[PDB]
Amino acid sequence: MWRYPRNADQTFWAFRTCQRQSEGAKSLREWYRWNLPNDEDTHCYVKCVWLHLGLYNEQNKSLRVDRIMEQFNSRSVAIPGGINTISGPTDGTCKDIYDKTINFFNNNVNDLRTAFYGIKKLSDEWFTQNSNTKPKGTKISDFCNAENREKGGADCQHACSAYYYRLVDEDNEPIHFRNLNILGITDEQFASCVKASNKQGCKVADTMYNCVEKHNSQALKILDNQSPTY
Ligand SMILES: COCCOCCOCCOc1ccc(C(C)(C)CC(C)(C)C)cc1
C-alpha cells in the first residue's frame, strides 16, 4: 500500500519513469524545464506522472485530492487555489486529466516544485539527509548489494532490488500498474507475476523479481543500467 507524503526519491522515480515511457515525445525538452505543452504525448506524460506518484485513483478515475493536499501540508507549502478544477471524476483519458490539471500546474509551478522536490537544492538536501535511500548516481544493484539489504531483514535474495525496480512498494505489495512493455514484459506477463505473488514479506519481492526475470532475462538488467538517475 502506498505511503504519503511522497519523498524525493519517489517523486524523482515517477518523473523519470514517465519520461522514459515517452522518450520519443516532441515536447520532452519542454518537460525538462517544467513546461507542459498542449499535445497528446504531454497529456499522457502528465497522466503517467499523477499515476506513478500514487495520486490517481484508478477505481474512481479521480485524483487523490486528499493526498495532494497532504503533500503540500507536509512540505509546509500553502494549499493552492483552484483545487475544485482538479477534483472529481475524469473520463479516464490523458486529455481529460491534463485539462483538469494544467491550470493548477501553470498557476502554481514553483510551489508544486517545492512540494514535489522538483528543485535541485531541495532534492539534494533530501537525499543527503536520507542516506538509507539509494543516492542519485548509484545503481540499484550496487546500493542493494550493500549492508545486506537484499535479505530484507530475513532470508530473501531481492528484497531491496524489487523495491527500487518498483515491482513492490514499501509494504512488499506488488505495484499493479507497472509498465515494463518496452523491456519485453507484456501486461499479461506482468499481471501473471502479480497473481503468482499469496506470499508474505520480502518473499513477495523475490517472487516478483524471479518471475519478471523468467519472462525476460534482460528487463531487470536494463532497469539497473538506467537506475543511477532512473
Ligand atoms: C534529467 O532529469 C530531468 C528530470 O526532470 C524531472 C522533472 O520532470 C519534469 C516536470 O514534469 C512534470 C510532470 C507532471 C507534472 C504534474 C502536472 C503531474 C504536476 C505534479 C508533478 C506537481 C504533480 C508536472 C511536471
Residue numbers in the entry: 0 to 196, 198 to 230
The article reads:
In this study we demonstrate, using binding studies and bioassays, that the sand fly long-form D7s do in fact bind both cysteinyl leukotrienes and thromboxanes, and thereby serve as anti-inflammatory and anti-hemostatic agents in both sandflies and mosquitoes. Consistent with these structural observations, the sand fly proteins were found to perform the same anti-inflammatory and anti-platelet functions as their mosquito counterparts through the binding of cysteinyl leukotrienes and TXA2 in the N-terminal domain, but do not bind biogenic amines, as this function is performed by the yellow proteins.
The structure of ABI15936 was determined using single anomalous diffraction methods with a selenomethionine-substituted variant protein prepared in E. coli. An initial model containing two protein monomers was built using the experimental electron density map and then positioned into a wild-type data set by molecular replacement. As suggested by sequence comparisons, the protein is made up of two linked odorant binding protein (OBP) domains with a well-ordered domain interface fixing their relative orientations. The N-terminal domain contains a hydrophobic channel leading from the surface to the interior of the protein that is much like the eicosanoid binding pocket in Aedes and Anopheles long-form D7 proteins. The N-terminal domain of ABI15936 contains two disulfide bonds that are conserved in the mosquito proteins. Although ABI15936 was crystallized in the absence of any potential natural ligands, electron density was observed indicative of a non-protein molecule occupying the N-terminal domain binding site.
